[PDB]
């Protein structure tokens, strides 16, 4: 009841292969995982069915292992297929949500496959320019100098 | 050595001064000694009949 810090608390704690804060709210603290935003964190925690007002160190270890399974395998846990990151993948055609350095692997893969096929988007990516059709006469000068 | 602060009552406004009109010449007599009337240069919109604080008595207002 708005009590002191319990003994079973972690102020910095490890999830997958990266650490997340403890003082933050439980949903906002886990968005630091590279690939999950506020909406995904909130929906997977609502499916985790726990107290949302408690911080990240008040999450007991069984709740840790509970939330990570949901966040890793959303499609079995009634998460809508339109909610996911890798909808209709170009490799397997199977929806998934990519997290941490897995997302880094996927993005690097997209860049290098576009580079291999020598598409205009891939060439713009390699040259570091803009890829979404916007102008380049006046902007980007911070990144260029 | 420091002169005591007192008040002066505006009798009438003489004109605008300060090379930009920012100041306003006024004729004021102290209610403490109603015989003595001096010109002072004020800062801000001042009407006739209002009073204002004066930190000194000897000092008068020159042009500008």
């Amino acid at each position: 009841m708005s009590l002191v810090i319990p003994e079973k608390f972690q102020h910095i704690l490890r999830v997958l292969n990266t650490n997340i804060d403890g003082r933050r709210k439980i949903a906002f603290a886990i968005t630091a995982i590279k690939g999950v935003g506020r909406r995904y964190a909130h929906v997977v925690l609502r499916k985790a069915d726990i107290d949302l007002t408690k911080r990240a160190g008040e999450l007991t270890e069984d709740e840790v292992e509970r939330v990570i399974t949901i966040m890793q395998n959303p499609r079995q846990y009634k998460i809508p297929d339109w909610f996911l990151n890798r909808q209709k993948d170009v490799k397997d055609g199977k929806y998934s949500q990519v997290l941490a350095n897995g997302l880094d692997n996927k993005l690097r893969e997209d860049l290098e496959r576009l580079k291999k096929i020598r598409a205009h988007r891939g060439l713009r990516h390699f040259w570091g320019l803009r890829v979404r059709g916007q102008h380049t006469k006046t902007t980007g000068r911070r990144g260029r100098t | 050595r420091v002169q005591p602060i007192k008040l002066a009552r505006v009798t009438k406004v003489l004109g605008r001064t300060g090379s930009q009109g920012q100041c306003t010449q006024v004729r004021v007599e102290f209610m403490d000694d109603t015989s003595r009337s001096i010109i002072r240069n004020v800062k801000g919109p001042v009407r006739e009949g209002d009073v204002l604080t004066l930190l000194e008595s000897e000092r008068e207002a020159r042009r500008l």
């Binding site: 909406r39 909130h42 929906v43 609502r46 809508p80 | -």
Partner: protein
């Protein structure tokens, strides 16, 4: 005293009605309540997990205040400013599906019905219970 909903504070009245609909289990909810966004201009899910009962409570007094309010009327009512990112803000309407689900749920609850023209209106039992809860919440508010 004959107390009508127009005689009571709406901030308290809405939560009173939502509490009543929470008490009565006849009202139905869709399974996607905890997942979907309430509008195009919303940036986050609603904080309350009873937001559906809140929505029904709001639209109940809205249809009481004026009838003929269809799904589009509900979405215009519940619409809000869209931040548009870097573009200047604008107005966007609410979700059509959430208005459809709430109005159809009230219709199944059978205190609202389709009119001789478009839109829906309260049954007399609807305002009967609305003024009942308004009277009891007014008594609790005053004393």
């Amino acid at each position: 005293p004959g107390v009508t909903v127009k005689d009571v504070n709406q901030q308290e009245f809405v939560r009173a009605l939502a509490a009543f609909l929470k008490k009565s289990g006849k009202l139905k909810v869709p399974e996607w309540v905890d997942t979907v966004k309430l509008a195009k201009h919303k940036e986050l899910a609603p904080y309350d997990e009873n937001w559906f009962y809140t929505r029904a409570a709001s639209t109940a007094r809205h249809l009481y205040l004026r009838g003929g309010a269809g799904v589009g009327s509900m979405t215009k009512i519940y619409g809000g400013r869209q931040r548009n990112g870097v573009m200047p803000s604008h107005f966007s309407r609410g979700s059509k599906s959430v208005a459809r689900r709430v109005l159809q749920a009230l219709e199944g609850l059978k205190m609202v019905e389709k009119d001789q023209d478009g839109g829906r209106k309260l049954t007399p039992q609807g305002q009967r219970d609305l003024d009942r809860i308004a009277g009891q919440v007014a008594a609790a508010n005053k004393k």
